[PDB]
Design a protein around this ligand. Sequence first.
Ligand code: MMA
Ligand code: MMA
Ligand code: MMA
Ligand code: MMA
Ligand code: MMA
Ligand code: MMA
Lengths: 438, 438
Amino acid sequence: GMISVGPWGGSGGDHWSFKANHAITEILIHVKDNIKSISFKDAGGDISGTFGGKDPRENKKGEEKKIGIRWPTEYLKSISGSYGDYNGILVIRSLSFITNLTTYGPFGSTSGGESFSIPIADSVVVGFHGRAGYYLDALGIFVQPVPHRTISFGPWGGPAGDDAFNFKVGSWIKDIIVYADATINSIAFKDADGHCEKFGGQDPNDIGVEEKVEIDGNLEHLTSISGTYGNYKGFEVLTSLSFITNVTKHGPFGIASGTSFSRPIEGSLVTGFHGKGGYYLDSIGIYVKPRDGSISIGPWGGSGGDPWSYTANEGINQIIIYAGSNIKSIAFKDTSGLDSATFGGVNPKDTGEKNTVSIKWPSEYLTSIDGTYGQYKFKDVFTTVTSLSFTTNLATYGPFGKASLTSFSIPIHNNMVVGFHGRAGDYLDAIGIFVKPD
Amino acid sequence: GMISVGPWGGSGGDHWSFKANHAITEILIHVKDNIKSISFKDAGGDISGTFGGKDPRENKKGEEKKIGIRWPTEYLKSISGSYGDYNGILVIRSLSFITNLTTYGPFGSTSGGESFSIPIADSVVVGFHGRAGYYLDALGIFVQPVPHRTISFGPWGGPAGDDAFNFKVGSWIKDIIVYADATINSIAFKDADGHCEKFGGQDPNDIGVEEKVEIDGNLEHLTSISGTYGNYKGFEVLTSLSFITNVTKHGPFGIASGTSFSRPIEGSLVTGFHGKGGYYLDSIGIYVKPRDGSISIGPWGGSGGDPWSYTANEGINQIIIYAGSNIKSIAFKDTSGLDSATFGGVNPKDTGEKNTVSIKWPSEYLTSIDGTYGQYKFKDVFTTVTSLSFTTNLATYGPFGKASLTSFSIPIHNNMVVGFHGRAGDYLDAIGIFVKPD
Ligand SMILES: CO[C@H]1O[C@H](CO)[C@@H](O)[C@H](O)[C@@H]1O
Ligand SMILES: CO[C@H]1O[C@H](CO)[C@@H](O)[C@H](O)[C@@H]1O
Ligand SMILES: CO[C@H]1O[C@H](CO)[C@@H](O)[C@H](O)[C@@H]1O
Ligand SMILES: CO[C@H]1O[C@H](CO)[C@@H](O)[C@H](O)[C@@H]1O
Ligand SMILES: CO[C@H]1O[C@H](CO)[C@@H](O)[C@H](O)[C@@H]1O
Ligand SMILES: CO[C@H]1O[C@H](CO)[C@@H](O)[C@H](O)[C@@H]1O
């Protein structure tokens, strides 16, 4: 799917939204003291309508400018501009067009209003939305990641923090653990699977107070964040935060001081975080995916273990499986480097042997899994997956482990596997798949 | 999905295409001796761009007309108009807007060009496409069926034929059997499943010559038809036909005489036919679905029987199952009356007892099936489905038949069943499902 950003400007005129089928290669504007109208052309040569330009007065036509994007080598990544009063109406006064190579603009008046910019990385502008009548009341963008990347916002805060962090998750962000009083002392995260995370919080003299947010991820999801950054005991840091969902706002935690950051985004899901800490939380950014469903099959195996799941962002490239007389652990690698956790293998005295499956994406993609489950006894008796195999549109890989009496398979066709789920602890208790058509 | 119709007009200007998110409620045009520009508004209040209107000369602005569609009671169903030369260019000269209540127009010059109209029923205009620069070079429409209906084109030919026919299929049109020499004598059709069909061909003195078209329906599909109608031995009938695919044109069969009909359509699949015959083929029309994939699961059962499949057009409402100590036959009813054939039950001495499942669509929809298969002996020993049950998001229905040793089920979630497939002869040899997410 795509993430919406903005729109910036007024609430007059009529709403419009133009998603280009191919890359945006041309923007035409008419502009004088403000932007009278805008239209787009795409790589295959389709034009959008002309949005705005409806003032009947000849003076008020403005001048035509054409911005050409030199596809396929140049691609639009972002915009900047300004909005303000024009003869009484809150309107887009100027625009810039931000490419991977350069900036076209600014076009229109940069005086008499308020500017905007976007703290975004790794995006491609795939469309626009906004408002118009006589003029361009409002404008915002639609974005997708550049190939094999994930759109980034931020980071906000200071340039300090000796312990940097990045990660992304294949499922959702489920628990957030924050310490704070005067500022944000530290931040940690618990992936739906129970895999945890941590940051900041290294001042023995300023520890703050713990708060816990559980995101109830079937109905609720983390869509964005807001907060504040400012000078704290000399350091430029993040001083408050709030975790924003479709259901509610969790927080704010901390103390709002310095400068507020918000992000006008819609259609987003926060899959990850990046930034730096130390004594406190110097900086933080987010990774977002489009709130783009899978069918779910299984899981097969025992009742033990913590639930886990993994959905590839792009397409699953690799599977790492540890086996002995049962399956010990399993992990996934996708084409865009979004590794999954290792599910299982928590006991260092029983981790078995490594096996690997390679899948030649895109011409090869996973079709299903097969296997057995049964009882395995180590220090205690468990019912877990004991053997596993995988099928692609081209081949079968595996088997791995030791077959037991109870077997499972799926006579499925015209699909692709887009992720896995199950339960795991010391071992892979249970496993199933997520599939989509085609 | 949606079916494209047209565009009509010239090949100058730039291409554009606007699919409205909600119903089209307004069309604005600028027009003088031709249509200078066009734009649309939708029920939620989004506007499209203004397509055309780029002539810099003030004379050449044209006059604004607004056509309001009185949603939700009035909906646009079609258009008509004309194209012809305007100062040197092949261009839309006039337009009409065809609603379920009335016609708005005509707007522009009806002289000096060529008109078009659309032999269409049961459609809703959901968008437009076309071409523009200074003016409206070209215009075509996007259509979807009105709810619970199927878009119809035609019929073409005469008003005579005492034996009318209609049908639609849930899978594809696989074999076409035509008799013809001077005209089309008769036409018959063989559904992918092997279910046959027939028409015309009742003149003992004029039988024509048989021709057979098999549509190789995995890669090839029937997208449209063309042909000719004219006076034949006094009767106005269809005198030639061709069956048009994405791979090739099959035919023309017969003799081209009278008037040629074609249909400018894209994105279509012919799911059905309607019209009338007698001695010969008086008339014929088509039903088309948007060339909108399902995942396929199973089938479970024996190797015997002819393959069959069924995909609901809307959502499956009812299941009729005949059972004894095995399953005899199964058939489906969907919400839009697209019944499926009966699969199985060909032997009148072994048809067992009727059972029925009702599903309360949309809040109830099928989730999966369960059952057994085994050996059944009547006049000969068969391996067929012997028992069946169905699950919805709400309940389980069945079981029906007599359970045997070998059982089958699918631990599947977050899906819906959108059709069935398998094999059948005298009985239901084998059965599986087609599923989609959500
Ligand atoms: C001329 O007035 C119209 O156009 C402007 C934008 O051009 C809107 O702000 C306003 O609400 C009207 O729709
Ligand atoms: C106390 O110093 C540490 O912590 C602060 C933030 O608390 C960072 O700016 C600094 O680089 C060190 O990592
Ligand atoms: C060692 O115990 C853990 O691991 C097994 C599977 O290995 C699970 O059944 C159990 O619930 C715990 O999570
Ligand atoms: C003025 O010329 C332009 O516009 C017309 C339609 O307005 C096109 O036919 C032509 O090819 C150019 O694109
Ligand atoms: C011979 O008459 C029959 O056949 C012709 C077409 O062949 C029909 O027009 C007519 O109504 C009868 O059904
Ligand atoms: C009576 O024979 C037919 O029916 C059975 C199932 O009923 C099939 O196995 C067989 O191939 C024929 O189609």
